[PDB]
Ligand binder design. Structure first.
Ligand SMILES: Nc1ncnc2c1ncn2[C@@H]1O[C@H](C[C@@H](N)CC[C@H](N)C(=O)O)[C@@H](O)[C@H]1O
Ligand SMILES: Nc1ncnc2c1ncn2[C@@H]1O[C@H](C[C@@H](N)CC[C@H](N)C(=O)O)[C@@H](O)[C@H]1O
Lengths: 241, 241
């Protein structure tokens, strides 16, 4: 059977190692290029990854993310789903939303989900408190498989109220229950779940607890070890249940 | 002093009657072209306005809304704000978001606000329950005036939890408190508030209760009369307070 694994590898190199039409569900949150959007100007609370400075020319960052999304479109099975978590950023005192580059991809946007994180450290009073991230639910372009009946009532809507995972030592993770919602509704046991920016391995832990197959890529061997330790101490608990 | 009024007039004709740089705050929700997006195919729960069928060729609808937004950019004062309420629609089983046309306007998007309506009559289980509308906060292009300190804690964030106004006889209105948040934070007493799709006059009632000047346009004399009756029975109550 397929060997589930977290591979230390560049995300595009990993995606290009997968055949067409081979992944049922992708759940992922890329680096957000906050430092790079600022042209390298430091800021308080700056996200610094183990082996990545998050400081790419913004136009090049957008082209890179488009290549990622286009590879995801290739590797998705017909009827599969890709959940891409991003957030509105700020550029020159104006909104800088992900939609400005997402719309050019081969993937077809099925629905935008709102992740309500409840609170944010950013209390700048020049705008409303920005505690929302977006989860773009894409499907392949050539309705997706979706079983909303599997969810509790409080996750059947387009706003998901999930607090950030403050106990996770990774600098910018998402909670396990977020990945669980995506996986449970769009896959069957044994189906392949992929996270090409696996980080602390949240998507893979969720897939494992739900008895789905899993594959993750990240460039940090420290984060791979973080996943392995987390998997070992996971009692296969599903946080939804 | 300026004569506050609800005028029965086409929205573009009304906007083009205003000089440049003359309006501090716009709050508006246009017809959403749900029937027109469907190419005129009827649907249950169809919105039918008094004098408007909501059935425009979708490309022409988008060009029209762009003309509206471009006129708003012209008539806004520097530092003013326009709050444009729209919603993701569905086309051919895929997402059809307003951003696909909003991005071409002369207005500069400052922030997207999420209006959480709590529930929706649309219980189609092929997607998550779509009870969110968006409020696009734009400013003029050549930070906007904004006093978040005037709001209660529960409206300082990017999600506003406001139930729909089910007692309003207009077929598709928004609640008074929505307009109050926008007006209170971006204007001073006496400043001009405009709604070019005034409907039941919600924006104008809110402006009047806050002692702002107001101007509204709509094509229905029935809705103008609806506003006049509503204003007369309004005890100048501010729902926020
Ligand atoms: N070229 C790249 N290929 C693969 N991973 C990368 C690359 N550049 C950055 N990363 C990783 O992208 C990840 C982004 C994280 N925010 C993801 C965290 C993850 N959602 C979690 O729950 O832990 C980081 O762990 C980076 O190490
Ligand atoms: N060309 C037009 N010019 C002005 N108003 C129009 C035009 N076409 C449609 N309308 C109006 O657009 C309005 C859209 C409404 N959904 C607005 C309701 C409003 N937000 C309220 O709270 O009552 C309707 O009242 C229509 O009569």
């Amino acid at each position: 059977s397929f060997t589930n694994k977290y591979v230390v590898l560049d995300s595009l190199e990993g995606l290009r190692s997968l055949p067409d039409n081979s992944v049922q569900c992708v759940v992922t949150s890329p680096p957000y290029n906050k430092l790079g959007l600022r042209e390298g100007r430091p800021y308080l609370g700056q996200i610094i990854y183990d082996t990545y400075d998050d400081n790419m020319n913004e136009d090049d960052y957008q082209k890179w993310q488009l290549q990622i999304l286009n590879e995801i479109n290739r590797i998705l099975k017909p009827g599969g789903s890709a959940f891409y978590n991003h957030k509105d950023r700020r550029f020159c005192k104006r909104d800088h939303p992900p939609e400005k580059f997402l719309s050019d991809s081969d993937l077809e946007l099925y629905q935008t989900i709102i992740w309500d994180r409840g609170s944010t450290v950013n209390q700048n009073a020049r705008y409303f408190r920005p505690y929302v991230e977006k989860i773009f639910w894409f499907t392949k372009s050539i309705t997706p498989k979706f079983h909303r009946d599997r969810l509790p009532e409080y996750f059947k809507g387009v706003i998901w109220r999930i607090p950030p995972d403050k106990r996770n030592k990774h600098p910018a993770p998402f909670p396990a229950i977020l990945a669980e919602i995506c996986i449970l509704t769009t896959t069957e046991e044994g189906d392949l779940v992929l996270d090409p920016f696996a980080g602390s391995g949240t998507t893979l832990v969720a897939a494992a607890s739900l008895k789905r197959s899993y594959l993750g890529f990240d460039i940090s061997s420290k984060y791979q070890k973080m996943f392995h330790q987390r998997l070992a101490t996971s009692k296969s608990k599903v946080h939804l249940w």
